[PDB]
Design an enzyme around this catalytic site. Structure first.
Site, PDB file in Angstrom:
ATOM      1  N   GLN C   2     -11.574 -29.304  -7.719  1.00 49.88           N
ATOM      2  CA  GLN C   2     -10.588 -29.411  -8.779  1.00 49.88           C
ATOM      3  C   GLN C   2     -11.027 -28.867 -10.127  1.00 49.88           C
ATOM      4  O   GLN C   2     -10.229 -28.250 -10.831  1.00 49.88           O
ATOM      5  CB  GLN C   2     -10.179 -30.859  -8.939  1.00 49.88           C
ATOM      6  CG  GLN C   2      -8.957 -31.016  -9.789  1.00 49.88           C
ATOM      7  CD  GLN C   2      -7.778 -30.279  -9.198  1.00 49.88           C
ATOM      8  OE1 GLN C   2      -7.042 -29.608  -9.923  1.00 49.88           O
ATOM      9  NE2 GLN C   2      -7.592 -30.388  -7.890  1.00 49.88           N
ATOM     10  N   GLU C   3     -12.274 -29.106 -10.498  1.00 49.10           N
ATOM     11  CA  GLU C   3     -12.781 -28.629 -11.784  1.00 49.10           C
ATOM     12  C   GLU C   3     -13.873 -27.619 -11.537  1.00 49.10           C
ATOM     13  O   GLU C   3     -13.618 -26.514 -11.062  1.00 49.10           O
ATOM     14  CB  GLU C   3     -13.319 -29.781 -12.635  1.00 49.10           C
ATOM     15  CG  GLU C   3     -12.276 -30.741 -13.176  1.00 49.10           C
ATOM     16  CD  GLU C   3     -11.500 -30.151 -14.313  1.00 49.10           C
ATOM     17  OE1 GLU C   3     -11.922 -29.148 -14.832  1.00 49.10           O
ATOM     18  OE2 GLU C   3     -10.491 -30.709 -14.674  1.00 49.10           O
ATOM     19  N   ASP C   4     -15.103 -28.021 -11.810  1.00 49.50           N
ATOM     20  CA  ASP C   4     -16.246 -27.222 -11.447  1.00 49.50           C
ATOM     21  C   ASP C   4     -16.801 -27.747 -10.132  1.00 49.50           C
ATOM     22  O   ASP C   4     -17.834 -27.291  -9.650  1.00 49.50           O
ATOM     23  CB  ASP C   4     -17.291 -27.254 -12.548  1.00 49.50           C
ATOM     24  CG  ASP C   4     -16.791 -26.600 -13.831  1.00 49.50           C
ATOM     25  OD1 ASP C   4     -15.949 -25.736 -13.753  1.00 49.50           O
ATOM     26  OD2 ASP C   4     -17.254 -26.968 -14.882  1.00 49.50           O
ATOM     27  N   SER C   5     -16.084 -28.698  -9.540  1.00 54.92           N
ATOM     28  CA  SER C   5     -16.421 -29.213  -8.232  1.00 54.92           C
ATOM     29  C   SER C   5     -16.074 -28.166  -7.188  1.00 54.92           C
ATOM     30  O   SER C   5     -15.271 -27.273  -7.450  1.00 54.92           O
ATOM     31  CB  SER C   5     -15.681 -30.512  -7.986  1.00 54.92           C
ATOM     32  OG  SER C   5     -14.295 -30.307  -7.920  1.00 54.92           O
ATOM     33  N   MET C   6     -16.690 -28.255  -6.017  1.00 55.67           N
ATOM     34  CA  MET C   6     -16.488 -27.242  -4.989  1.00 55.67           C
ATOM     35  C   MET C   6     -16.387 -27.841  -3.601  1.00 55.67           C
ATOM     36  O   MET C   6     -16.838 -28.959  -3.361  1.00 55.67           O
ATOM     37  CB  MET C   6     -17.632 -26.245  -5.012  1.00 55.67           C
ATOM     38  CG  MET C   6     -17.889 -25.587  -6.352  1.00 55.67           C
ATOM     39  SD  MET C   6     -19.327 -24.517  -6.300  1.00 55.67           S
ATOM     40  CE  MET C   6     -20.600 -25.731  -5.999  1.00 55.67           C
TER      41      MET C   6
END
Ligand SMILES: [Zn+2]
Ligand SMILES: [Zn+2]
Ligand SMILES: [Zn+2]
Lengths: 111, 46, 147, 65, 270
Positions: C2-6
């Site tokens: 969602q963000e800098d998550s992967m």
């Protein structure tokens, strides 16, 4: 550290039956079934076949969270067509088609 | 008597005990390797 | 993601994607000056040791050391260093019995968990016995790891 | 440090291709791309497993223990 | 879904490839089959390593990891007791396969340790399993590790039964190609373009098996997904045709198991 056991993706645990059938209250002739230790590899087949049954008014599913191998199935049918039996019919149907799939492949392979 | 450790820079085993000096008898090194346990070690290949 | 998550492929991780090997080294020295007190290395005993730690010493050999390959986890003791009871004014040894064998051992860091890789036994320029232990463990990509 | 058994993205065993790969580059003197093709490595997700592999183990074996 | 469906046509075939045209099926089943082949087919693989001797460069678990990824003959895997259901303590020949590895740098040159050097110790009981899959034309099945003259490696392995859901090491599918509606007639995708999508996008090889759409055609909104082009590979542990057949069997068993569960509940109901 705190990672879950990969066995929990398909093996039933203690107190975990394979299926649990609850009755819906939002609509008549509608139930919600919980599939334990079972993702939509199987689940998507079930919905697909249920929607090929003209006596089924609603058939849909959802995986509430990917951390858990659980699958929610909601079925609504027309009056008299017990949704539980509708599901039983869908299963019989799927198996029969798979039987032919196997047979046709084996024949085609041999040739 | 007992293999307590093995010489460094040389496969020669020392098997020396306390007070016998850390100096390698046949090298003069002072490193000493404990050597892998006799116990089998199980790993989960997974 | 969602963000800098992967989102990472678990099957790839299973095969060995970004898997790494971690090493950590511990150490200790023989002693100081033998003024009626000396220090050494030796496997301690619950009933024959004073102020013993709340871990374990049953993985130690005669000299309080652990041979390579042995699985050592958490509070487990790795270097059985001992240092005589010092109940007196001079902070030296004393004429006691079971509690005369006071310890001063070293264990793994409480968060560590692996096996003993290599143990080194030498002396410094002062002729003092020196123990150095290297341990290792595998780090497999988790949902909190940074890339 | 030795060639990964199986492609990370596929599971296709490439751990038995390294030796012959090098031979294709040396004995046959082929372009790395054509060598990979000769190994049957069609998908680029498998080609990279060999194409960018670093054989460090040869360096490690230079030490004497 | 009533038998008169799945029309299996094979375009190409080899030891590790089956190129399909599966028509007259529900997309859900085409995908379900794809998925079940990927991760629900039982195979044999090393799931435990005892390190007796290791003076090599590589770490103990580094090697153990590699060993677990070596494909083992799994033709008769269905005759091997699934370890979770094996009442026999630890493990036994009825539910596990024991292999050993012994290597020593006899030569001054680099000694290579290969999967072909694994030796089966346990009693296979005539079952066709455990044999390291060797598809190397040189006979040198998978390189486990390299070995220096003065070094030695002695391992004991225990192979068990499992599926890819447990760990990727268990998978046999390798890779599965999957495509449908070669020509974008169902409009399931909207081609991205900077000028002309008809020229910018490569025409799929499967397009030669279906008549091209005409610009005078109206959107056939009644049309459904059908005719799926697939290409199933294999890692060698299971004959590529068995990968597919067994995948199909698995789905039948899965549906049957929930059908059984429904029956079980009805039996328990009044
Ligand atoms: Zn020496
Ligand atoms: Zn690949
Ligand atoms: Zn058993």
């Amino acid at each position: 550290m705190n990672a879950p056991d990969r066995f929990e993706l398909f093996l039933l645990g203690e107190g975990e039956s394979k299926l649990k059938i609850d009755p819906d209250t939002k609509a008549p002739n509608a139930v919600v079934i919980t599939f334990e230790k079972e993702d939509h590899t199987l689940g998507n087949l079930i919905r697909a076949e249920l929607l090929n049954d003209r006596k089924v008014l609603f058939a849909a599913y959802k995986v509430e969270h990917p951390f858990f191998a659980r699958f929610k199935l909601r079925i609504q049918t027309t009056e008299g067509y017990d949704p539980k039996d509708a599901l039983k019919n869908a299963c019989n149907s799927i198996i029969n088609k798979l039987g032919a799939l196997k047979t046709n492949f084996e024949t085609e392979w041999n040739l | 008597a007992t293999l307590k450790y093995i010489c460094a820079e040389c496969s020669s085993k020392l098997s020396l005990s306390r007070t016998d000096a850390v100096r390698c008898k046949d090298c003069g090194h002072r490193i000493l390797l404990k050597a892998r346990t006799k116990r089998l070690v199980q790993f989960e290949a997974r | 993601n969602q963000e800098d998550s992967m989102i990472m492929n678990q099957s790839s991780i299973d095969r060995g994607l970004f898997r790494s090997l971690f090493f950590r080294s511990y150490m200790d020295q023989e002693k100081k000056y033998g003024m009626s007190i000396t220090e050494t290395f030796e496997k301690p005993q619950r009933t024959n040791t004073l102020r013993m730690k709340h871990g374990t010493y049953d993985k130690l050999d005669d000299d309080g050391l652990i041979a390579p390959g042995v699985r050592v986890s958490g509070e487990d003791v790795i270097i059985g260093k001992t240092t005589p009871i010092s109940p007196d004014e001079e902070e030296l040894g004393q004429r006691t019995a079971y509690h005369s064998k006071r310890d001063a051992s070293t264990p793994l860091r409480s968060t560590e968990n692996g096996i003993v890789d290599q143990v080194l036994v030498t002396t410094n320029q002062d002729g003092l016995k020196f123990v150095k232990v290297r341990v290792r463990t595998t780090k497999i990509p988790q949902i909190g790891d940074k890339f | 440090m030795i060639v990964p058994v199986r492609c990370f993205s596929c599971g296709k065993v490439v751990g038995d291709k390294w030796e012959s790969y090098l031979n294709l580059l040396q004995e046959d003197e082929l372009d790395e791309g054509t060598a990979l093709s000769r190994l049957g490595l069609k998908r680029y997700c498998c080609r990279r497993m060999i194409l960018t592999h670093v054989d460090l183990i040869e360096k490690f074996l230079r030490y004497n223990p | 879904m009533s038998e008169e469906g799945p029309q299996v046509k094979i375009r190409e075939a080899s030891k590790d490839n089956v190129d399909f045209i599966l028509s007259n099926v529900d997309l859900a089943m085409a995908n379900s089959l794809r998925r079940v082949m990927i991760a629900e087919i039982p195979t044999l693989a090393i799931d435990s390593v005892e390190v007796e001797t290791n003076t090599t460069v590589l770490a103990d678990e580094f090697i153990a990891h590699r060993l677990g990824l070596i494909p083992l003959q799994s033709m008769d895997i269905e005759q091997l007791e699934y370890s979770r259901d094996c009442f026999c303590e630890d493990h036994c020949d009825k539910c596990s396969v024991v292999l050993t590895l012994q290597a020593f740098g006899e030569s001054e040159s680099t000694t290579n340790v290969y999967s072909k050097d694994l030796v089966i110790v346990s009693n296979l009981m005539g079952r066709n399993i455990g044999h390291p899959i060797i598809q190397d034309k040189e006979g040198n099945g998978v390189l486990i590790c390299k070995l220096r003259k003065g070094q030695e490696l002695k391992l004991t392995c225990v192979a068990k039964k499992g599926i890819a859901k447990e760990h990727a090491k268990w998978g046999p599918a390798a890779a599965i190609e999957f495509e449908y509606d070669p020509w974008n007639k169902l409009k399931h995708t909207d081609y991205w373009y900077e000028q002309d999508s008809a020229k910018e996008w490569p025409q799929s090889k499967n397009c030669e098996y279906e008549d091209p759409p005409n610009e005078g055609d109206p959107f056939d909104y009644k049309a459904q997904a059908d005719t799926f082009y697939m290409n199933v590979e294999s890692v060698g542990s299971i004959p590529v045709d068995q990968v597919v057949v067994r995948g199909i069997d698995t789905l039948q068993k899965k549906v049957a198991s929930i059908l059984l569960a429904l029956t079980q509940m009805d039996q328990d109901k009044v």
